[PDB]
From TrEMBL:
Gene3D superfamilies given in the database record: Glutaredoxin
Pfam families the UniProt entry points to: HyaE (PF07449)
Species of provenance: Salmonella typhimurium (strain LT2 / SGSC1412 / ATCC 700720)
GO molecular function: isomerase activity
Protein name, per record: Thiol-disulfide isomerase and thioredoxin
Signal peptide: none
CDD domains associated with the record: HyaE (cd02965)
Keywords carried by this UniProt record: Isomerase
SUPFAM superfamilies listed in its UniProt record: Thioredoxin-like
Cross-referenced InterPro entries: NiFe-hyd_mat_HyaE (IPR010893), Thioredoxin-like_sf (IPR036249)
Family: Belongs to the HupG/HyaE family.
Length: 142
């Protein structure tokens, strides 16, 4: 891993709320380790009035599924583009649904509650089993 790096005060404020800062590359190993969790991409950008969203409702989501212990990560602004591409969310703000150490999908659309429950539940209906392929190294050379 790295040494942890707060890019700016605008960034570090998210770390004050919590969550792990991940990259498009190192998110792979992160997922396999945590098993169950959600990655927050670069969500809502600035507008003009305070009609923004900001990740505050993701907490109640997490606590609504207390069956698993979810780890939440943040994909910065840059990593979100590569990560979004990889998980086929195109390039739009969405939460990545990871359970069982495997990808369930993304949450693009469905913003208010009620519908979110059934929509997400439809995807996380039944638990599964992961392929289990964790190649970790100490020092092969670097």
């Amino acid at each position: 891993m790295a040494n942890d790096t707060p890019f700016s005060a605008l960034w570090q404020r998210l770390l004050t709320r919590g969550w792990q800062p991940v990259e498009a590359s190192t998110v792979d190993d992160w997922i396999k380790r945590v098993g169950d969790g959600v990655i927050l991409l670069s969500s809502d950008p600035r507008r003009t009035p305070e009609v923004s969203d900001n990740p505050v409702m993701i907490a109640e989501l997490l606590r609504e599924f207390p069956q698993f212990d979810w780890q939440v990560a943040v994909a910065d602004l840059e990593q979100s583009e590569a990560i979004g591409d990889r998980f086929n969310v195109r390039r739009f703000p969405a939460t990545l649904v990871f359970t069982d150490g495997k990808l369930r999908g993304a949450l693009s659309g469905i913003h208010p509650w009620a519908e979110l429950l059934t929509l997400m539940r439809s995807i996380v209906d039944t638990p599964a089993a992961q392929e289990t392929v964790q190649l970790e190294h100490h020092h092969h050379h670097h």
